[PDB]
Amino acid sequence: VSEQSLNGRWTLKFFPQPAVPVMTIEGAEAANGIVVDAVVPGNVEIDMEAAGLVEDPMVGNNIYKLRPYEGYQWYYSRTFAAPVVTEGQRLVLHFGGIDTFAEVYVNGIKVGSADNMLIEHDYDITSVVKEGENRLDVIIRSSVMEAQNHFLGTLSIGNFSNEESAPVRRAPSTYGWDIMPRLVSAGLWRDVTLRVENPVTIVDANWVTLSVNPKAREASESLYLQTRLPFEMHDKVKAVITISRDGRQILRKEALMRKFANLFTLNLSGVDAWWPRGYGEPALYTAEVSLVDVTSGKIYDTKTSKIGFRTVKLELDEVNGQFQFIINGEPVFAKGTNWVPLDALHSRDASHVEEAVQLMVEMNCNIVRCWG
């Protein structure tokens, strides 16, 4: 119903991490360090380069000058306005990417402890939020020093990957590889928003294609719908499923919500199969699910995403890379590129996606292996 973006100007205070890692706001505010203006989404090296503290790591041997910052802490801080919350609604603080080990505080109350830079982090701050200036503080610590909180095995020492990359859940290339430099970095490298969810809301809408007949233009699509639904709203909410493409409507099915989870099967007709590049057309259909009150017609939540009617099977021969991809029942030849980091400063990956995908379009790639 509402999603206020917390992206923009933040306050970044960085200092050398002492023997005891700083965990609370009091220690970060009392520590001696340097304070500059930060941009979220963004890496801490971008915020320091915008202040003239570090030189361009992209030129010469200047990449080695960012070495001492690997043992630094990073203190993001800002204030935000609190949206109105009615009875039953929840206020979720959504981090898209925390790099990496950080302690999140809302009005001085710890709301979460992030330890992964590859997944999202959601925190219900419905109770701790007050009226007026709501402080938001994220105190990140060094990812290199965190590797010493573990005891590694023999088979985890001496490999191509860095031994600092073994115990933590980060991108291995951020530590050094053959086609990417060592830029570990830190910071909210993705979007930070404030989502408001109604008591009746869709938790997950999983689409799965069961059968595809690309010739007769038919397909069977299943929907595993999981929703949060107060019991007073049972038998009073309906699920609206709409399958459309290019504006025209193909299927519309309604069903009364008697359970929080249901499986809706759809025997669609007049639809096209999603084929890889070359073997057909990438036929996409906009699929939408909405939870509507059966009396007042009010929409509680809506999930919209484009799906594709396709089936995938890997026929492996082993002894007797000895496998072949089968899409929609046909053996396809895979020819494409391996996708590597779009930027050592991963917060700028979003600005390169549009340009880099077109490189595979001009290359006529029908497959791309996102490198681990």
């Binding site: 005891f151 095995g153 023999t154 088979l155 985890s156």
Partner: protein
Amino acid sequence: GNVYEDTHFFELCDKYGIMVWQDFAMGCGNYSQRDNFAAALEKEAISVVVKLRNHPSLILWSGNNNDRVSRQVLSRVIYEFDPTRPYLPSWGPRGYYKDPFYTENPSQFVSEIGYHGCPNRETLERMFSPDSVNPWQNGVVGMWNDEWQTKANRIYDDKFQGGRNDLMTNQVRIIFGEVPADLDDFIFASQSVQAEAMKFFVELWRGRRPYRTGIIWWNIRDGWPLLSDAISDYWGGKKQAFYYMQNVHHDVCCLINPAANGYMLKVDNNTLKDFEGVVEVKDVASGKQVFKGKFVSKANQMSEIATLPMQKGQGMLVISYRIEGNEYFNHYLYGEPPYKLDQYRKWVKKCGIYEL
């Protein structure tokens, strides 16, 4: 069943070149299959492996036990913290040592095999009370007094007759026919059956190479003043099996193994070198010579020397072989049980190898 020995044990096994087969601290029986026990065992396994993975002596980890502990918790500790040494997830009637249970056991590598032998007199006089040094309760042989039953070993003071101690009188009655009443004659009788049995097994494994790959006998030393199947007691007392087995544990050892129509004089080499020498086999009682020839022992293999003819009745042969001007000795007891304790004691004294 024992704790984990500290570093020195392994430092000495490194200095003197003794390979170590460490068994995780678990004994006869199945264990729990649940989380809280596997967590306590994983913590122990990681601790002991990291502590004892830099000693060249240790060569194998083994769990004594679809067991989650034997075929998972410990295999996982070895897979991550020591991929260099192998991990292994894995007696009988205790009758005559020439019974088909031992002579026809197809195991290439036996890890536990022993025979009972009463300790020395000086150990008995220090263990039991003065009124309990003699084993026979109320003077009748076979019946053990309560102090002898206690140190067999019985965990709980359930007072009873027989059991583990009966193996001593049973095995002596098999080889020598009748259990002696005198204590000094009983000590010599039990230790001789233990020595002739343990020596027979090592000779049976070293002599049947390349099929037989090893033999780990039980055991070398006792941990309590006790009456065991070990070859030496807590206090220093080398039972007679300790000396019989010294001569069948040499790097190059000549030994006679039984055969159907006769015997077989063999030699075993536990080195990577070749050795030449002469071997002379005589009869202790009569004094005649059975064989005398030069043998060639190639490296790391048993070599058959000669086929000795069948000997009449009972007696003892003497094996004397010289290698690089050094004379080494062994023997072979031919015939079938029972024997006479006085005749066997005289055969030993003539052979002159082992004191009495």
